Coordinates of C-alpha atoms and ligand atoms in Angstrom, one line a residue:
Chain C
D1 CA 74.2 127.9 36.2
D2 CA 71.1 126.0 35.1
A3 CA 68.6 127.1 37.9
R4 CA 66.9 129.9 36.1
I5 CA 66.5 128.1 32.8
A6 CA 65.2 125.0 34.5
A7 CA 62.7 126.9 36.7
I8 CA 61.4 128.7 33.5
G9 CA 61.1 125.4 31.7
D10 CA 59.1 123.7 34.5
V11 CA 56.7 126.6 34.7
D12 CA 56.3 126.2 30.9
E13 CA 55.7 122.5 31.2
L14 CA 53.1 123.2 33.8
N15 CA 51.3 125.6 31.7
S16 CA 51.3 123.2 28.9
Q17 CA 49.8 120.5 31.1
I18 CA 47.1 123.0 32.0
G19 CA 46.7 123.5 28.3
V20 CA 45.9 119.8 28.0
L21 CA 43.4 120.0 30.9
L22 CA 41.7 122.9 29.1
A23 CA 41.1 120.7 26.0
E24 CA 38.8 118.7 28.2
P25 CA 35.1 119.4 29.0
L26 CA 35.0 121.7 32.1
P27 CA 32.6 123.7 34.2
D28 CA 32.6 127.2 32.9
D29 CA 34.0 128.7 36.1
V30 CA 36.8 126.1 36.4
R31 CA 37.6 126.9 32.7
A32 CA 37.7 130.7 33.4
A33 CA 40.1 130.2 36.4
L34 CA 42.4 127.8 34.5
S35 CA 42.7 130.2 31.5
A36 CA 43.5 133.1 33.8
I37 CA 46.2 131.0 35.5
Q38 CA 47.8 130.3 32.1
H39 CA 48.3 134.1 31.8
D40 CA 49.7 134.3 35.3
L41 CA 52.1 131.5 34.5
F42 CA 53.2 133.3 31.3
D43 CA 54.0 136.3 33.4
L44 CA 55.6 134.2 36.2
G45 CA 58.0 132.7 33.6
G46 CA 58.9 136.3 32.5
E47 CA 59.7 137.4 36.0
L48 CA 62.0 134.4 36.5
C49 CA 63.7 135.2 33.2
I50 CA 64.3 139.0 33.2
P51 CA 66.5 140.6 36.0
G52 CA 65.0 143.6 37.8
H53 CA 61.6 142.6 36.3
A54 CA 58.6 141.7 38.5
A55 CA 55.1 140.6 37.6
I56 CA 53.5 138.5 40.4
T57 CA 51.9 140.6 43.1
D58 CA 49.7 140.3 46.1
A59 CA 46.8 140.5 43.8
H60 CA 47.7 137.3 42.1
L61 CA 48.2 135.6 45.4
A62 CA 44.9 137.0 46.7
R63 CA 42.9 135.7 43.6
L64 CA 44.4 132.2 44.2
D65 CA 43.5 132.4 47.9
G66 CA 39.9 133.4 46.8
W67 CA 39.7 130.5 44.4
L68 CA 40.9 128.0 47.1
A69 CA 38.3 129.3 49.6
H70 CA 35.5 129.3 47.0
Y71 CA 36.0 125.8 45.5
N72 CA 36.7 124.2 48.8
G73 CA 33.6 125.6 50.3
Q74 CA 31.9 124.0 47.3
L75 CA 33.2 120.6 48.3
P76 CA 32.5 118.2 51.2
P77 CA 35.3 117.8 53.9
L78 CA 38.2 115.4 53.1
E79 CA 37.5 112.0 54.6
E80 CA 40.6 110.2 53.7
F81 CA 43.9 110.4 51.7
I82 CA 43.1 110.6 48.0
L83 CA 44.8 108.8 45.2
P84 CA 45.3 110.9 42.1
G85 CA 42.8 109.8 39.5
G86 CA 39.0 109.6 38.7
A87 CA 37.4 111.3 35.7
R88 CA 39.9 112.1 33.0
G89 CA 39.6 115.8 33.9
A90 CA 40.4 115.1 37.6
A91 CA 43.3 112.9 36.6
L92 CA 44.9 115.6 34.4
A93 CA 44.4 118.1 37.2
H94 CA 46.5 115.9 39.4
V95 CA 49.2 115.6 36.7
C96 CA 49.1 119.4 36.7
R97 CA 49.4 119.5 40.5
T98 CA 52.5 117.3 40.4
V99 CA 54.1 119.3 37.7
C100 CA 53.3 122.5 39.6
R101 CA 55.0 121.1 42.6
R102 CA 58.0 120.1 40.4
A103 CA 58.1 123.9 39.2
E104 CA 58.0 125.0 42.8
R105 CA 61.0 122.9 43.6
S106 CA 63.0 124.5 40.9
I107 CA 61.8 128.0 41.8
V108 CA 62.9 127.4 45.4
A109 CA 66.3 126.1 44.1
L110 CA 66.6 129.3 41.9
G111 CA 65.8 131.6 44.8
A112 CA 68.6 129.9 46.8
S113 CA 71.3 130.8 44.3
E114 CA 69.9 134.1 43.1
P115 CA 68.0 137.1 44.5
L116 CA 64.3 136.5 43.8
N117 CA 61.2 138.0 45.0
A118 CA 59.0 135.6 47.1
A119 CA 55.8 135.9 45.1
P120 CA 56.8 133.3 42.5
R121 CA 57.2 130.4 44.9
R122 CA 54.1 131.6 46.9
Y123 CA 52.1 131.6 43.7
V124 CA 52.9 128.1 42.7
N125 CA 52.6 126.9 46.4
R126 CA 49.0 128.1 46.3
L127 CA 48.4 126.8 42.7
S128 CA 49.4 123.3 43.7
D129 CA 46.9 123.3 46.4
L130 CA 44.2 124.8 44.0
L131 CA 44.8 122.1 41.4
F132 CA 44.3 119.5 44.1
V133 CA 41.0 121.1 44.9
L134 CA 39.9 121.6 41.3
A135 CA 40.6 117.8 40.8
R136 CA 38.0 117.1 43.4
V137 CA 35.6 119.5 41.8
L138 CA 36.0 117.9 38.4
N139 CA 35.3 114.4 39.9
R140 CA 32.3 115.9 41.6
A141 CA 31.2 117.5 38.3
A142 CA 31.6 114.3 36.5
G143 CA 29.1 112.7 38.8
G144 CA 31.9 110.6 40.3
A145 CA 34.0 110.8 43.5
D146 CA 37.6 110.9 44.6
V147 CA 39.7 107.8 44.6
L148 CA 40.5 106.7 48.1
Chain X
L1 CA 55.9 144.4 52.6
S2 CA 53.4 141.7 51.4
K3 CA 49.8 142.2 52.7
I4 CA 49.0 138.5 52.0
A5 CA 48.9 136.1 54.9
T6 CA 51.5 133.5 55.0
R7 CA 50.8 129.9 54.2
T8 CA 52.7 126.9 55.8
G9 CA 55.4 126.4 53.0
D10 CA 55.5 129.9 51.6
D11 CA 59.1 130.1 52.8
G12 CA 60.2 127.4 50.5
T13 CA 60.5 124.7 53.2
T14 CA 58.2 121.7 54.0
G15 CA 58.0 119.1 56.8
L16 CA 58.6 115.4 56.8
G17 CA 56.5 112.7 58.6
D18 CA 58.9 112.6 61.5
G19 CA 58.5 116.4 62.3
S20 CA 61.8 117.5 60.6
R21 CA 61.8 120.4 58.0
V22 CA 63.6 120.6 54.7
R23 CA 63.8 122.9 51.9
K24 CA 61.6 122.0 49.0
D25 CA 64.5 121.3 46.5
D26 CA 65.9 118.7 48.9
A27 CA 66.7 115.4 47.2
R28 CA 64.1 113.6 49.4
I29 CA 61.3 116.0 48.4
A30 CA 62.2 115.7 44.7
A31 CA 61.9 111.9 44.9
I32 CA 58.6 112.1 46.7
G33 CA 57.5 114.4 44.1
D34 CA 58.5 112.1 41.1
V35 CA 56.7 109.3 42.9
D36 CA 53.6 111.5 43.1
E37 CA 53.9 112.5 39.4
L38 CA 54.1 108.9 38.3
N39 CA 51.0 107.9 40.4
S40 CA 49.3 110.8 38.7
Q41 CA 50.1 109.6 35.2
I42 CA 48.8 106.2 36.2
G43 CA 45.6 107.9 37.2
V44 CA 45.4 109.3 33.7
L45 CA 45.9 105.9 32.2
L46 CA 43.2 104.5 34.6
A47 CA 40.7 107.0 33.1
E48 CA 41.0 105.1 29.8
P49 CA 39.1 101.9 28.9
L50 CA 41.1 98.9 30.1
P51 CA 40.9 95.2 30.6
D52 CA 39.5 94.4 34.0
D53 CA 42.7 92.7 35.1
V54 CA 45.0 95.4 33.9
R55 CA 42.8 98.0 35.8
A56 CA 43.0 95.8 39.0
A57 CA 46.9 95.8 38.8
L58 CA 47.3 99.5 38.1
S59 CA 44.8 100.4 40.8
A60 CA 46.7 98.3 43.3
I61 CA 50.0 99.9 42.2
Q62 CA 48.5 103.3 43.0
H63 CA 48.1 102.2 46.5
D64 CA 51.7 100.8 46.6
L65 CA 53.0 104.2 45.2
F66 CA 51.1 106.1 48.0
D67 CA 52.9 103.9 50.6
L68 CA 56.3 104.2 48.8
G69 CA 55.9 108.0 48.9
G70 CA 54.8 107.7 52.6
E71 CA 58.0 105.8 53.2
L72 CA 60.0 108.6 51.6
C73 CA 58.1 111.0 53.8
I74 CA 59.0 109.3 57.1
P75 CA 62.8 108.6 57.3
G76 CA 63.5 105.2 58.7
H77 CA 60.1 103.9 57.8
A78 CA 59.5 100.8 55.8
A79 CA 56.2 100.4 53.9
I80 CA 57.5 98.6 50.8
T81 CA 58.3 94.8 51.5
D82 CA 59.3 91.7 49.6
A83 CA 55.5 91.1 49.2
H84 CA 55.3 94.3 47.0
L85 CA 58.2 93.2 44.9
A86 CA 56.9 89.7 44.6
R87 CA 53.5 91.0 43.4
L88 CA 55.2 93.1 40.7
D89 CA 57.4 90.1 39.7
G90 CA 54.2 88.0 39.5
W91 CA 52.4 90.5 37.3
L92 CA 55.5 90.5 35.1
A93 CA 55.5 86.7 34.6
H94 CA 51.7 86.7 34.2
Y95 CA 51.6 89.2 31.4
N96 CA 54.9 88.3 29.7
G97 CA 53.9 84.6 29.6
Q98 CA 50.8 85.6 27.5
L99 CA 52.8 87.7 24.9
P100 CA 55.0 86.6 22.2
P101 CA 58.8 87.1 22.7
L102 CA 60.1 90.6 22.1
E103 CA 61.6 90.6 18.6
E104 CA 62.7 94.0 17.3
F105 CA 63.1 97.1 19.4
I106 CA 59.8 98.9 19.8
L107 CA 59.0 102.6 19.9
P108 CA 56.7 104.1 22.6
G109 CA 53.2 104.3 21.3
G110 CA 50.3 102.6 19.6
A111 CA 46.8 102.6 21.0
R112 CA 46.1 105.6 23.3
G113 CA 46.2 103.4 26.5
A114 CA 49.6 101.8 25.5
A115 CA 51.1 105.2 24.6
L116 CA 50.1 106.4 28.1
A117 CA 51.5 103.3 29.7
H118 CA 54.8 104.2 28.1
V119 CA 54.6 107.8 29.5
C120 CA 54.0 106.1 32.9
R121 CA 57.1 103.9 32.2
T122 CA 59.3 106.9 31.5
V123 CA 58.1 108.9 34.5
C124 CA 58.6 105.8 36.6
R125 CA 62.2 105.6 35.5
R126 CA 62.6 109.3 36.3
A127 CA 61.4 108.6 39.8
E128 CA 63.9 105.7 40.0
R129 CA 66.7 108.1 39.2
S130 CA 65.7 110.5 42.0
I131 CA 65.2 107.7 44.5
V132 CA 68.7 106.5 43.7
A133 CA 70.0 110.0 44.1
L134 CA 68.3 110.4 47.5
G135 CA 69.8 107.0 48.6
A136 CA 73.4 108.2 47.7
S137 CA 73.1 111.1 50.1
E138 CA 70.8 109.5 52.8
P139 CA 70.6 106.0 54.2
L140 CA 67.5 104.4 52.5
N141 CA 66.0 101.0 52.2
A142 CA 66.7 99.2 48.8
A143 CA 63.0 98.3 48.5
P144 CA 61.7 101.5 47.0
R145 CA 64.5 101.4 44.4
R146 CA 63.8 97.7 43.7
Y147 CA 60.1 98.4 43.4
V148 CA 60.3 101.1 40.8
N149 CA 62.8 99.1 38.9
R150 CA 60.4 96.4 38.5
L151 CA 57.4 98.8 37.8
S152 CA 59.0 100.4 34.7
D153 CA 59.5 96.9 33.3
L154 CA 55.8 96.1 34.1
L155 CA 54.6 99.4 32.6
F156 CA 56.5 98.4 29.4
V157 CA 54.8 95.0 29.4
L158 CA 51.4 96.3 30.1
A159 CA 51.8 98.7 27.2
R160 CA 52.3 95.7 24.9
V161 CA 49.3 94.0 26.6
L162 CA 47.2 97.2 25.8
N163 CA 48.2 97.3 22.2
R164 CA 47.0 93.7 21.8
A165 CA 43.8 94.4 23.7
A166 CA 43.0 97.2 21.3
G167 CA 43.5 94.7 18.4
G168 CA 46.7 96.3 17.4
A169 CA 50.5 95.8 17.7
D170 CA 53.6 97.4 19.1
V171 CA 55.3 100.1 17.0
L172 CA 58.6 98.9 15.7
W173 CA 61.8 100.6 15.3
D174 CA 63.4 100.7 11.9
Chain E
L1 CA 68.1 89.2 53.6
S2 CA 65.4 89.8 51.0
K3 CA 63.6 86.6 49.7
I4 CA 63.3 88.2 46.3
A5 CA 65.8 87.5 43.5
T6 CA 68.0 90.5 42.5
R7 CA 67.8 92.2 39.1
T8 CA 71.1 93.5 37.7
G9 CA 69.8 97.1 38.2
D10 CA 68.5 96.6 41.7
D11 CA 71.6 98.1 43.3
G12 CA 70.9 101.4 41.7
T13 CA 73.6 101.0 38.9
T14 CA 73.1 100.4 35.2
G15 CA 75.1 99.6 32.2
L16 CA 76.2 101.7 29.2
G17 CA 76.7 100.3 25.7
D18 CA 80.5 100.4 26.2
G19 CA 80.5 97.7 28.9
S20 CA 80.9 100.2 31.7
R21 CA 78.4 100.9 34.6
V22 CA 77.2 104.1 36.2
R23 CA 74.9 105.0 39.0
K24 CA 71.2 105.6 37.7
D25 CA 71.4 109.2 38.7
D26 CA 74.4 109.8 36.4
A27 CA 74.0 112.7 34.0
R28 CA 74.1 110.4 30.9
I29 CA 71.3 108.2 32.3
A30 CA 69.2 111.4 33.0
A31 CA 69.6 112.5 29.4
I32 CA 68.7 109.1 28.1
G33 CA 65.7 109.1 30.2
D34 CA 64.5 112.6 29.1
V35 CA 64.8 111.7 25.5
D36 CA 62.8 108.5 26.1
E37 CA 60.1 110.5 28.1
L38 CA 59.9 113.0 25.1
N39 CA 59.6 110.1 22.5
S40 CA 56.8 108.6 24.8
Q41 CA 54.9 111.9 24.9
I42 CA 55.2 112.1 21.1
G43 CA 53.7 108.5 21.2
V44 CA 50.7 110.0 23.0
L45 CA 50.4 112.7 20.4
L46 CA 50.4 110.1 17.6
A47 CA 47.4 108.5 19.1
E48 CA 45.4 111.6 18.3
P49 CA 43.9 112.2 14.8
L50 CA 46.5 114.1 12.7
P51 CA 47.1 115.5 9.3
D52 CA 48.9 112.8 7.1
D53 CA 52.1 114.8 6.7
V54 CA 52.3 115.7 10.4
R55 CA 51.9 112.0 11.4
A56 CA 54.7 111.1 8.8
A57 CA 57.0 113.6 10.4
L58 CA 56.3 112.8 14.0
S59 CA 56.6 109.1 13.3
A60 CA 60.0 109.6 11.6
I61 CA 61.0 111.7 14.6
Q62 CA 60.3 108.8 16.9
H63 CA 62.9 106.6 15.1
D64 CA 65.4 109.5 15.4
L65 CA 64.8 109.8 19.0
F66 CA 65.4 106.1 19.6
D67 CA 68.6 106.5 17.7
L68 CA 69.5 109.4 19.7
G69 CA 68.9 107.5 23.0
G70 CA 71.1 104.9 21.4
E71 CA 74.0 107.3 20.8
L72 CA 73.8 108.5 24.4
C73 CA 73.9 105.0 25.7
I74 CA 77.1 104.3 23.6
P75 CA 79.5 107.1 24.9
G76 CA 81.3 108.4 21.7
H77 CA 79.3 106.6 19.2
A78 CA 77.5 108.6 16.6
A79 CA 74.1 107.9 15.3
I80 CA 72.5 111.4 14.7
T81 CA 74.1 113.1 11.8
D82 CA 73.7 116.5 10.0
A83 CA 71.3 114.4 7.7
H84 CA 68.8 114.3 10.6
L85 CA 69.3 118.0 11.5
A86 CA 68.8 118.9 7.8
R87 CA 65.4 117.0 7.6
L88 CA 64.3 118.9 10.7
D89 CA 65.3 122.2 9.0
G90 CA 63.4 121.0 6.1
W91 CA 60.1 120.3 8.0
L92 CA 60.5 123.7 9.9
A93 CA 60.7 125.6 6.6
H94 CA 57.8 123.5 5.2
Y95 CA 55.4 124.1 8.2
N96 CA 56.3 127.7 8.9
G97 CA 55.5 128.5 5.3
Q98 CA 52.2 126.9 6.0
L99 CA 51.4 129.3 8.8
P100 CA 50.7 133.1 9.0
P101 CA 53.2 135.3 10.8
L102 CA 53.0 134.8 14.6
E103 CA 52.2 138.4 15.9
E104 CA 51.4 138.0 19.7
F105 CA 52.8 135.6 22.2
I106 CA 51.1 132.2 22.4
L107 CA 49.9 130.3 25.5
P108 CA 50.3 126.5 25.3
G109 CA 46.9 124.9 24.4
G110 CA 44.0 124.7 22.0
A111 CA 42.7 121.5 20.4
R112 CA 43.9 118.5 22.3
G113 CA 46.6 117.7 19.7
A114 CA 48.0 121.2 19.8
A115 CA 48.1 121.1 23.5
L116 CA 49.9 117.8 23.4
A117 CA 52.4 119.1 21.0
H118 CA 53.2 121.9 23.4
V119 CA 53.7 119.4 26.2
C120 CA 56.0 117.6 23.8
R121 CA 57.8 120.9 23.2
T122 CA 58.4 121.5 27.0
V123 CA 59.6 117.9 27.5
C124 CA 61.9 118.3 24.5
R125 CA 63.4 121.4 26.0
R126 CA 63.8 119.4 29.2
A127 CA 65.7 116.7 27.4
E128 CA 67.8 119.5 25.8
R129 CA 68.9 120.8 29.3
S130 CA 69.8 117.3 30.3
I131 CA 71.8 116.8 27.2
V132 CA 73.6 120.1 27.8
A133 CA 74.3 119.2 31.4
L134 CA 75.8 115.9 30.2
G135 CA 78.3 117.9 28.0
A136 CA 79.4 119.8 31.0
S137 CA 80.9 116.6 32.4
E138 CA 81.8 114.6 29.3
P139 CA 83.0 115.3 25.7
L140 CA 79.8 115.1 23.6
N141 CA 78.9 115.3 19.8
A142 CA 77.0 118.4 18.9
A143 CA 74.3 116.6 16.9
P144 CA 72.2 115.4 19.9
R145 CA 71.7 118.9 21.2
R146 CA 71.3 120.5 17.8
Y147 CA 68.6 117.9 17.1
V148 CA 66.4 118.4 20.2
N149 CA 67.0 122.2 19.9
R150 CA 65.6 122.1 16.3
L151 CA 62.9 119.7 17.4
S152 CA 61.6 122.1 20.2
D153 CA 61.1 124.7 17.5
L154 CA 59.4 122.3 15.1
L155 CA 57.0 121.1 17.8
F156 CA 56.0 124.7 18.5
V157 CA 55.2 125.2 14.8
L158 CA 53.4 121.8 14.6
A159 CA 51.2 122.9 17.6
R160 CA 50.1 125.8 15.6
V161 CA 49.4 123.6 12.5
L162 CA 47.4 121.2 14.6
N163 CA 45.2 123.9 16.0
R164 CA 44.3 125.0 12.5
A165 CA 43.9 121.5 11.3
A166 CA 41.6 120.7 14.2
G167 CA 39.5 123.8 13.4
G168 CA 40.8 125.3 16.6
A169 CA 43.1 128.3 17.1
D170 CA 46.3 129.2 19.0
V171 CA 45.7 130.7 22.5
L172 CA 46.9 134.3 22.6
Ligands
LIG1 N1 57.0 121.3 45.9 C1 56.9 120.1 46.4 N2 57.3 118.8 45.7 C2 57.2 117.6 46.2 N3 56.6 117.4 47.5 C3 56.1 118.4 48.2 C4 56.2 119.9 47.8 N4 55.8 120.7 48.7 C5 55.4 119.9 49.8 N5 55.6 118.6 49.6 C6 55.2 117.3 50.3 O1 53.9 117.2 50.4 C7 53.3 117.3 51.8 C8 52.2 118.3 52.0 O2 52.2 119.2 50.9 P1 51.8 120.8 51.1 O3 52.0 121.4 49.8 O4 50.6 121.0 51.9 O5 53.1 121.2 52.1 P2 53.6 122.8 52.4 O6 53.9 123.4 51.1 O7 54.7 122.8 53.4 O8 52.2 123.4 53.1 P3 51.2 124.7 52.5 O9 50.6 124.2 51.4 O10 50.2 124.9 53.7 O11 52.2 125.9 52.3 C9 54.5 117.5 52.7 O12 54.6 116.5 53.7 C10 55.8 117.5 51.8 O13 56.7 116.5 52.2
LIG2 N1 65.8 104.8 35.6 C1 66.4 104.9 34.4 N2 66.3 106.0 33.7 C2 66.9 106.2 32.4 N3 67.6 105.2 31.8 C3 67.8 104.0 32.5 C4 67.2 103.7 33.8 N4 67.5 102.5 34.2 C5 68.2 101.9 33.1 N5 68.3 102.8 32.1 C6 69.0 102.5 30.8 O1 68.1 101.7 30.0 C7 68.7 100.5 29.5 C8 67.8 99.4 29.9 O2 67.1 99.6 31.1 P1 66.9 98.5 32.1 O3 65.8 99.0 33.1 O4 66.6 97.2 31.5 O5 68.4 98.5 33.0 P2 68.6 98.0 34.5 O6 67.7 98.7 35.5 O7 70.0 98.2 34.6 O8 68.3 96.4 34.4 P3 67.2 95.7 35.2 O9 65.8 96.3 34.8 O10 67.2 94.3 34.8 O11 67.4 95.8 36.7 C9 70.1 100.5 30.3 O12 71.0 100.1 29.3 C10 70.3 101.6 31.0 O13 71.5 102.4 30.6
LIG3 MG1 52.0 123.7 49.6
LIG4 MG1 65.4 98.5 35.2

């Protein structure tokens, strides 16, 4: 039906939102991670599209896990629920976060109607969490703080 | 086969505030998501220069949206009340009263802030559709629906307010 | 009983231009919404500095999209014609002949304007899916789908044009 084409489109939309975030000033490390993720998302979309073709591996998941641990250990503990916003960069990261979750919903729907490896949903599951973390990093880097 | 440790929702499911689990493509999770996406777009608008009063209203709205999402997360919970709807209706009367009557149809755009407000407006209307869809398959309070109904209207109004504030005007349709 | 007055759309239903009403999650309302969201994203791109011709094309497109939303609101009515499709084809030829042959795959991004154009492109394809879905349940003129299909291609080309105009470059 529409499941595959919809999932591909949402991943594309997410990747485009990340492109907008990349047009902003960013810490060099954050920029490097986001740029690499764009390539990952391009490959992810290809896996969703072509039958019998896989591209996302444990290595991709491991790298995301590594970035999560890294950036989180670079931030103070969460003291309260956060509202999406702050420096423009942080706000955009939150938009990316929500679009990534939207793509995850579509990927989950796709896997329910067609055989699909688990890597794609596990990738965006981690990515959503990382974008949340990166938003906090960007507020920090802007000399500001998260919106509570 | 995978050597990577499993994370909470790696299996495509997630939990609700009452302890129940649902698949991530569930209508309720979709509505929660659209509300979150709307709140995030408002965060982008808040990152722009804005009149103090407009910033105050939008900031308060983010809190409302956080609670609305929380209500969608905890089935049977009620965080959105008449007070919330009354405040939106008040802001609507407040800003509309200071603007000239809407003449021709307008196109979404203008000053960057007004343009962003229009994006917020459309994402808000998208959230309204998913909230309406959730309510058609699950008993839900009407407040959430009524709240976003008013919010898209207010976002439209605030877009006009922002074009004026920038010293410009609304983009008119041919 | 709520102490707040009710709006006509508070019950979750809304009206169509033909006097009928449907629930807001109806396929037709979803398509109207996505076209509106796309037009709004184009509004954000129009707030960026742009080459004069690109601004003229995008501004005209906003009027087309408003018309398209109007056609979707009035079931059966026809507002978008081949004339609109032809203009898009014209712009596609014009801007493509303004760019070097694309050799490698492109990632969405670059100068802010180009990045926004790609966001517009993805939202446009989302509206196309909604319009296509509407056709699965109701008879629908072909112009609306043909228009957004062409527009998604045009937005891709305009993104490339904007990267060059901003002294930037496409992300390979
Ligand atoms: N893809 C999604 N779209 C919208 N809302 C979501 C999505 N995934 C989770 N949520 C909601 O957000 C809350 C927490 O998000 P989180 O991503 O931590 O959940 P999870 O994916 O189940 O856990 P984990 O990240 O540890 O795998 C949950 O209460 C859930 O209702
Ligand atoms: N959530 C939505 N998404 C997309 N289109 C909508 C939505 N709600 C209404 N529309 C369409 O847009 C037009 C005007 O929107 P409006 O919000 O004024 O309608 P309503 O919600 O029925 O009325 P009210 O706002 O007074 O309750 C209507 O003709 C309707 O077809
Ligand atoms: Mg998760
Ligand atoms: Mg309404």
